[PDB]
Amino acid sequence: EKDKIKFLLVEGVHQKALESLRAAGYTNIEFHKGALDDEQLKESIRDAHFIGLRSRTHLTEDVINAAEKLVAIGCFCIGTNQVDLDAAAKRGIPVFNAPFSNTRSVAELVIGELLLLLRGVPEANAKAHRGVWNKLAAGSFEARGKKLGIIGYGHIGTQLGILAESLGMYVYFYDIENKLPLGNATQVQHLSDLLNMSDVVSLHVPENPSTKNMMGAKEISLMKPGSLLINASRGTVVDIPALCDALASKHLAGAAIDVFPTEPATNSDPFTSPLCEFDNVLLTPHIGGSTQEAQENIGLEVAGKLIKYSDNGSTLSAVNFPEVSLPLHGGRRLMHIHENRPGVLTALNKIFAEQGVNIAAQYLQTSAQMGYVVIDIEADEDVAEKALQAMKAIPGTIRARLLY
Amino acid sequence: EKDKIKFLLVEGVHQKALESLRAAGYTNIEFHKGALDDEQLKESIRDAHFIGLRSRTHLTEDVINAAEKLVAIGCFCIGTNQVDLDAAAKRGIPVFNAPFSNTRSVAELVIGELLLLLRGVPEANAKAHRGVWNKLAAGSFEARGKKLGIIGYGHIGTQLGILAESLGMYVYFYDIENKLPLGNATQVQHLSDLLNMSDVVSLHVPENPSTKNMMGAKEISLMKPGSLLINASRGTVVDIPALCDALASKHLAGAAIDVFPTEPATNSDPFTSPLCEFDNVLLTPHIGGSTQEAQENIGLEVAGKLIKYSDNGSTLSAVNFPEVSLPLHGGRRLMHIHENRPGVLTALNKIFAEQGVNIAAQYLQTSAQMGYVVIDIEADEDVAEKALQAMKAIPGTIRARLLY
Amino acid sequence: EKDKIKFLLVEGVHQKALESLRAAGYTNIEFHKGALDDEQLKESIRDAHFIGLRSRTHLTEDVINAAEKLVAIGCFCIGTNQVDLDAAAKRGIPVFNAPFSNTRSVAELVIGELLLLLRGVPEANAKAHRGVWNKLAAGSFEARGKKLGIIGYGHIGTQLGILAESLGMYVYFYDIENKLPLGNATQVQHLSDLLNMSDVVSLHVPENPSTKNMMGAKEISLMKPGSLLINASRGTVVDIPALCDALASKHLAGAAIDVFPTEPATNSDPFTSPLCEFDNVLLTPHIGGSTQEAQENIGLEVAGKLIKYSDNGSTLSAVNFPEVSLPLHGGRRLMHIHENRPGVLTALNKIFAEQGVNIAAQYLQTSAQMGYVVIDIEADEDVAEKALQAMKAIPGTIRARLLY
Amino acid sequence: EKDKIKFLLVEGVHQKALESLRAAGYTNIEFHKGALDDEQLKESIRDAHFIGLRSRTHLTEDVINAAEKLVAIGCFCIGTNQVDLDAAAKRGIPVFNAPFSNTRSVAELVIGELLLLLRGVPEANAKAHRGVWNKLAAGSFEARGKKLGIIGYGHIGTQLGILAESLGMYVYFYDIENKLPLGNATQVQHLSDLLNMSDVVSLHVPENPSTKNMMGAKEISLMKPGSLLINASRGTVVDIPALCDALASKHLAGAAIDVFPTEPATNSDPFTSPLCEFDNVLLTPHIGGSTQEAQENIGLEVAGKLIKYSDNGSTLSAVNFPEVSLPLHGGRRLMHIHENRPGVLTALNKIFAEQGVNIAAQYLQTSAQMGYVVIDIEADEDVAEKALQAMKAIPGTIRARLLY
Ligand SMILES: NC(=O)c1ccc[n+]([C@@H]2O[C@H](COP(=O)([O-])OP(=O)(O)OC[C@H]3O[C@@H](n4cnc5c(N)ncnc54)[C@H](O)[C@@H]3O)[C@@H](O)[C@H]2O)c1
Numbered sequence A, B, C, D: 001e002k003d004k005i006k007f008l009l010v011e012g013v014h015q016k017a018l019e020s021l022r023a024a025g026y027t028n029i030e031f032h033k034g035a036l037d038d039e040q041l042k043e044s045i046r047d048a049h050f051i052g053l054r055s056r057t058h059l060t061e062d063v064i065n066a067a068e069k070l071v072a073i074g075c076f077c078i079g080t081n082q083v084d085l086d087a088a089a090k091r092g093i094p095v096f097n098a099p100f101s102n103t104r105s106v107a108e109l110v111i112g113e114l115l116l117l118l119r120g121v122p123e124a125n126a127k128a129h130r131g132v133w134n135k136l137a138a139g140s141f142e143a144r145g146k147k148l149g150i151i152g153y154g155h156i157g158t159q160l161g162i163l164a165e166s167l168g169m170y171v172y173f174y175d176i177e178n179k180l181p182l183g184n185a186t187q188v189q190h191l192s193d194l195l196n197m198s199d200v201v202s203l204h205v206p207e208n209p210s211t212k213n214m215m216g217a218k219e220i221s222l223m224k225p226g227s228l229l230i231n232a233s234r235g236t237v238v239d240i241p242a243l244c245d246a247l248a249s250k251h252l253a254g255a256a257i258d259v260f261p262t263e264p265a266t267n268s269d270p271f272t273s274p275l276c277e278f279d280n281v282l283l284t285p286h287i288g289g290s291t292q293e294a295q296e297n298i299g300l301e302v303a304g305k306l307i308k309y310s311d312n313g314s315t316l317s318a319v320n321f322p323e324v325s326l327p328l329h330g331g332r333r334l335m336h337i338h339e340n341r342p343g344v345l346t347a348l349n350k351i352f353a354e355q356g357v358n359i360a361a362q363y364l365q366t367s368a369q370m371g372y373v374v375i376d377i378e379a380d381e382d383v384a385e386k387a388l389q390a391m392k393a394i395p396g397t398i399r400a401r402l403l404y
């Protein structure tokens, strides 16, 4: 609602987001197919109420300190570190993102790559292009009947497991946590067991200390001879050098790598990797999530999070903020962001008590140094307007707002 | 089961065939991982009873006539034009093959190929291997929800369709013979409709003057712009120079070709084609049938056809012989190939009648000008052997054999 | 987890509930395989904190008022009318139940019942047990290809339909609320269409003045002659005298009834009905929900709802209480039931403010005239206990409790 | 074809058979909804060419000796001993039947019965009718998750296994021969293993010496406590007395028996069995195959066998005759039934040889004392007529005919 509230979408955000916003009434949108030049980024953001960015723009302290009307930040991507999170929190600005927004894509990528990798297609094709005809049946196999090994049975591991069974494979998995096997997937106790019996292994694990170079010389040496390895999760999980030695020594028949340890910051930067020596290797520029339909639902999701926040104070899934949401029912909803310390809430509640106003529902969640609270009151437009002015005066206040 | 019934196997027939011959008590096996030149082929095939060959060996009337102990020919492939059928039938030598022995392989290939072509993976991998990062995710799409146009709803079309459906795609087919759609397939009335409607077009039609250059420059046009073309049928179906123009003009996003008009005689031959210049085009050396599983099955199929003929004159799936098979029950089995003229059978039966030998079963099937008959008689080895001799001396007798 | 927090369980609640209470450190359990009469119920429920009851125990205001230590009520069934909801809410006592805990059971029952009814098995078994052989196979039919008319496409309808589809039947449904058909289900516009079209008619609609005597003598008529009727919903939906006329007139081939208008108070009571005379009618004692698996799950569900409230005041699925739940993180949790009048919350918060006690989280949800709030405070047992005392002395305080 | 050829359908043969016949041109049909009185049976059969019966009429020697124009006998049922098989063979009359003609029915019966048996429905219903209300959950279970045990994995065992998996069960099986498990059925090595782990056991074994009282005291005592046994195969496989003791001692929760050791010869005869004392037992009058759709395809099948025989000499599946069939192609087909002895065939072939006629194809199969042979000749209507007259004169001839 309100044609007065400005939204600044940047970096070629999907059209579906612009439609969502507009359906909500938010029609003051400033679009930009690319990242803005620092000088105009500030010129655009200062008067902006909401900023929708991707991953190229870096919203740092003095940039955030440049936007005086900023209410919320929407990250149209999973990555969320191109922004001063706590500098935003400190100003009462929640950051939203789209985490599990592109799983079908990553799974479609892996199924496809394993089919052809198992067929020697990347090499035969590399050669065909170079003028050599290399027709061999020698070590080509059908996917049907093979055992897939998933490490990290989360959002993607599941999908891949489902699709794979359609192609006639036997999926097994390994997770640090016990999971509920979908379809006929079979959880394996020790990694070694997995590694020992899997024809093609795929990693769908998160980035953190325990997964750092998870797959190294030892683990790879455990994989049955002639197996394939597909890494489309995080570029820090596989020991590349160790991976080159197995490839070089024919321990592995081939592999697919979509994420590397250090990736070029732009398409204008040169890619470089030992993996370039191998024809039996599919090197991809960190895509897999990069599909038109993914961008499509990423847009819908995060424009949605921004809308809900705008309309009813919901901070669920917020990256740098305490999480609250309240089942809307009844007129008059206000919100308060403040310093987490004694007596703030009491003074907040007093305003209504002393006005004989009834509080219908109230939710308060607190972080380290800040507290957020959504309040519902059985009152009229005027009384609401009143209490608001008062709310703002409570020592500790950072932000207060009347949602409806 | 015989110690001196020589088996000549060339062109590296799968180990499972070798294995099954021995199981049938057939030991004398002269194996050859590769092809054998005419001069050498002759010395080998001379005292050979059976020969298993593939797409490269050429059994010309000359060679067939040089084969003295040649009883049956076995083609471990779906193609059979490499041997002079007529020059073989005339000598009472039937030829067997593996009719539809590798459909799942071509099906798996195309599924995997389209998935990656839709995603721009062939071109990305090309540049990445040349130190080029290319994250242009604009043209990347997901298979789910797309339309697969299958031209030729045959053994492979119906298979490709089923898998395509599992990935969430929509299948439409155009066939010359109105057929029963399996799954949610929809038969299209015209090529124009399908071409103008499909996202991915795959050909699976037979080779013949009707399909020669089917996909001409006009058909390529009728295709939805930005679409993909995949051809894993026969090299004569697509007009390649037209194909190349379409690619350079961007009317098509990519393609995957496995069968070419002119193909290399062997792997040591130079492969040349204009398609080599396009990175967004998957070129493969007529594989897609070349799969261990398919080879194993072909090996198991054709060898079994050889035994069954050797042990009990069954010529069921023969492509040049009359098809006869008789239930194996009772002692003494003989067979007789001969010219299809009146009187030969009466004179054959008479041999036993005047000897007061009771005939238990008899099956005679006749070719255009040939006749094949197999008889079960209630007698013993002596009468049998003696009766064999007589049969060989009948007007128009091409062959006679004591199966047991 | 407490040694003297008495749990009163009656009417034979499944062993899995007993098992889960103990797991939650709850030992004091007074179990009863059967029901307890009012006089005896009172002596037991007096010093009891929690009570788990089923369809037979009647918690009337009188009993509720006799319950002194009663903190929460748990209905191990889908029905909840056996307890005075209002007399419970007024005392800050919420009631839980198992909303949709046995749909697969009713689904399995009807599948099995129709299969046999279609085949004349109920009548045949009747006569056979009376020394009568009855091979009249004329009216026997196969389920495959038949039409199943589902009146009430709800939780059970959608389940019954899925199974029906697996047997090869055709499903059609008539609902009051236009809904999304799962599987190949077809929504019918009118009852007349469905009734006149279906082979087997099954009811799965809720009880209310709208469904009372739905299947009147007229509807029974609109049914295809020779059809079958199956009712495993509620006893008021079908006009039984009409039903009986239809059966005797042969307009209907058979029926299966599980729920009756008037049902026996207990198993020692006489069951009477006109349907008893028909052999082609399957009569069952309101079973179809009575399945070990369903009982196990209900036992596991409701007990868990009791723990969660006991250990952390969550009242999520309560049917009489405001629904509040707060993420369990941090020390000191209290809760407070009270009248929904202005000022009570401010006075509650003040207690901590003036004490310089920092409130970490707070959720207040309000009922029509009641209010429930649960608070997390950063203090210790002393302040907590001392703070509890104060809260109990607030104007309109119904209850207060120190959860941890 | 030929309105001159008479068909006598008896015992209420399905209308679908009458349609089939008529579509073939055979329009001379004498129908009878019931078994004929011996006197008129002979009056009807004497001039009849084909007889279609079920299982009530007994075609004995003097009855067969009464039909002078009888060509073939069609048994519209699986049972085939109400006919003098070898007395028919001796006269050159083949007998056909419909063996695997009613499997879906038997499977639908078993699924249905096991669902309800597992629920205690047969008893609860038996009681409901007698006026007692016995609502218990005590030992009622859902089919979902249970293990089914099939003994005899043939035509029915397979179907049942498939349907059962749809209901969510785990099917295991035991066969005297190694079979190929459909879906996810699991073959078990020893009966004991099966018996030990199966909740409900179903027998789909054939009648013969090794299956006589197959399931006795020992086998039953091996079944896990509280299991169910369903026998819908042959009444000689289960030791009834032993079955009564397990039921009586609660070793088994219930059972379903459709076939007994001695069954009443007509519905007017009293059924008597110890199994009548148990409510937890479903007694059925040997139905399961007795469904309208079964009768429907039985009719289509056997009227089809009679037609093919009539039209082209095919005796495949013939019960009392040597089996022959010849791929029709080319005009002029004749047939010959004779004494199996030397020189008959030679003399048969001479007729054509001496007339300069070419024999296109010939199939001869022989039994103990008789031989059947189908012949194809490249000749004209007249020459055919000629040879026929001659064929009839060959000593040993029993029957000869010109098919077309
Ligand atoms: N290549 C791409 O463009 C791309 C796109 C999207 C996501 N991803 C990556 O895929 C990975 C998985 O993504 P998701 O969304 O399915 O995440 P997820 O968090 O849902 O699942 C991760 C799984 O890993 C399991 N786990 C954690 N550590 C493990 C270990 N040490 N050993 C075994 N199991 C382990 C977890 O228990 C969990 O089930 C993430 O790293 C994500 O960044 C890559």
Ligand SMILES: NC(=O)c1ccc[n+]([C@@H]2O[C@H](COP(=O)([O-])OP(=O)(O)OC[C@H]3O[C@@H](n4cnc5c(N)ncnc54)[C@H](O)[C@@H]3O)[C@@H](O)[C@H]2O)c1
Pocket (backbone or CB within 6 Å): B100, B102, B106, B151, B152, B153, B154, B155, B156, B157, B174, B175, B176, B177, B204, B205, B206, B207, B210, B211, B232, B233, B234, B258, B259, B286, B287, B288, B289, B290
């Ligand atoms: N690339 C490989 O290694 C490889 C392997 C196996 C088979 N093949 C090819 O696969 C092709 C199809 O094989 P299959 O066994 O599925 O074929 P098939 O012979 O079973 O069916 C082919 C279908 O094409 C249809 N058709 C014929 N002419 C057509 C036309 N002009 N337009 C549209 N439809 C037409 C036919 O009606 C038939 O339904 C074969 O012709 C062969 O070229 C190639």
Ligand SMILES: NC(=O)c1ccc[n+]([C@@H]2O[C@H](COP(=O)([O-])OP(=O)(O)OC[C@H]3O[C@@H](n4cnc5c(N)ncnc54)[C@H](O)[C@@H]3O)[C@@H](O)[C@H]2O)c1
Pocket (backbone or CB within 6 Å): C100, C102, C106, C151, C152, C153, C154, C155, C156, C157, C174, C175, C176, C177, C204, C205, C206, C207, C210, C211, C232, C233, C234, C258, C259, C286, C287, C288, C289, C290
């Ligand atoms: N026999 C048993 O032991 C037993 C066990 C469980 C539930 N029940 C019964 O099952 C019934 C259905 O249960 P459920 O959970 O599937 O129901 P539900 O409440 O999930 O859905 C019932 C459906 O009936 C539809 N409807 C309402 N009035 C209708 C009308 N007048 N005409 C047509 N459709 C109408 C509603 O729109 C709804 O879709 C319950 O009402 C209850 O009576 C009985």
Ligand SMILES: NC(=O)c1ccc[n+]([C@@H]2O[C@H](COP(=O)([O-])OP(=O)(O)OC[C@H]3O[C@@H](n4cnc5c(N)ncnc54)[C@H](O)[C@@H]3O)[C@@H](O)[C@H]2O)c1
Pocket (backbone or CB within 6 Å): D099, D100, D102, D106, D151, D152, D153, D154, D155, D156, D157, D174, D175, D176, D177, D204, D205, D206, D207, D210, D211, D232, D233, D234, D258, D259, D286, D287, D288, D289, D290
């Ligand atoms: N109740 C009815 O009205 C009715 C109707 C039709 C058929 N039947 C009966 O069902 C039975 C099976 O019928 P089908 O048509 O599936 O037959 P089938 O012959 O196809 O299968 C029988 C199976 O039993 C297996 N087998 C044989 N002896 C066995 C043993 N000793 N132990 C383990 N396995 C054994 C066989 O190998 C075979 O797979 C037959 O007796 C048939 O008469 C009953």
